[PDB]
Ligand binder design. Structure first.
Ligand SMILES: Nc1ncnc2c1ncn2[C@@H]1O[C@H](COP(=O)(O)OP(=O)(O)OP(=O)(O)O)[C@@H](O)[C@H]1O
Ligand SMILES: CC(C)c1ccccc1-c1ccc(C[NH3+])cc1Cl
Length: 325
């Protein structure tokens, strides 16, 4: 069978806490007053959610209401408990209230409003210092949730809200987040395709917080090289091939051998043979202003097939890339 793995850091944080902290199924959800909120306009539409800008009529405060399609009750309880546990954490979105629609029986999460600007629109004004600054803000959020025994499992630009004017960053959408328990085998059908780590692609169930560090690496690579997404897979199998075209196939096979992973037969037909590419190969005139030897060294540490070799959020915070922040 596959070789078992344990997180390098925060391994037993949940073991040493009472069941109330991590037993989300036993969490008692209490509704606020949906009448305290007046919907203004639609902001977005997710996989199983509709998002509205709203105002809290009791204090004239602008808020965001995430109307959830109650497809799985257990999943809703999980998101709420995690948001409750992490409430007040550095750069963690604040859950302000939980409400229900009495006629159609629809739960809704109410969050603090963030005046967001998309990646494509943001890139043109972003300087080298700004990328270091915001990357550090994400790391504070990840080191905090990892220290709290939680894996985000959906790190990507769409889940990072940035109010550039106020230099304010918030890590959002905790619907796929999960508590880390050493030796637990997790569902690999998490994260978004472009940001899925190698462990998810090769079906290695015993993963940990490091998964988020791979996603963070994918984000950094797309910014410094202005190639969005960096690893552009067209399906989950193809996603691993796109990673192998950069990291090379040698280190991939060493990784599956180390953990005794049974690689799906499909891969023999699409994987092939690929050299390990130098990171400098992705530097061009359009992207060179956000590239430095420190940036490439930092990216190299984050983007590693072996989840245990990847830098932890605390280790990433000590990298020379952030000496200027
Ligand atoms: N506080 C917020 N401010 C603005 N947009 C948000 C906020 N929270 C969630 N969203 C949006 O709703 C979705 C959340 O999932 C995303 O599409 C995101 O853009
Ligand atoms: C600077 C920032 C941390 C970053 C680094 C790498 C890739 C993308 C991004 C990014 C994330 C979210 C948003 C707003 N939704 C905008 C941007 Cl520019």
């Amino acid at each position: 069978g596959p070789v078992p793995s344990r997180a390098r850091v925060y391994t037993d944080v949940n073991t040493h806490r009472p069941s109330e902290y991590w037993d989300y199924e036993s969490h008692v959800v209490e509704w606020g007053n949906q009448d305290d909120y007046q919907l203004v306009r639609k902001l977005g539409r997710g996989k199983y959610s509709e998002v509205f800008e709203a105002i809290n009529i009791t204090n004239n405060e602008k808020v965001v209401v995430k109307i959830l399609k109650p497809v799985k009750k257990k999943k809703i309880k999980r998101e709420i408990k995690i948001l409750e546990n992490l409430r007040g954490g550095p750069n963690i979105i604040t859950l302000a209230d939980i409400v229900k629609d009495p006629v159609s029986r629809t739960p809704a999460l109410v969050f603090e409003h963030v005046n967001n600007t998309d990646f494509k629109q943001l890139y043109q004004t972003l300087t080298d210092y700004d990328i270091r600054f915001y990357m550090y803000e994400i790391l504070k959020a990840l080191d905090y949730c990892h220290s709290m025994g939680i894996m985000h499992r959906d790190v990507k630009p769409h889940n990072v809200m940035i109010d550039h004017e106020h230099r304010k960053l918030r890590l959002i959408d905790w619907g796929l987040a999960e508590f880390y328990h050493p030796g637990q085998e997790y569902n690999v059908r998490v994260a978004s395709r472009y940001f899925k780590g190698p462990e998810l692609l090769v079906d290695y169930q015993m993963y940990d917080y490091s998964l988020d560090m791979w996603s963070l690496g994918c984000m950094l690579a797309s910014m410094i090289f202005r190639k969005e997404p960096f690893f552009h897979g067209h399906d989950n199998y193809d996603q691993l091939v796109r990673i192998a075209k950069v990291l090379g196939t040698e280190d991939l096979y060493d990784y599956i051998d180390k953990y005794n992973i049974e690689l799906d037969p499909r891969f023999n037909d699409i994987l092939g043979r690929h050299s390990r590419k130098r990171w400098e190969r992705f530097v061009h005139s359009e992207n060179q202003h956000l590239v430095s030897p420190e940036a490439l060294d930092f990216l190299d540490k984050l983007l590693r097939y072996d989840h245990q070799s990847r830098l932890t959020a605390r280790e990433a915070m000590e990298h020379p890339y952030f000496y200027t922040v």
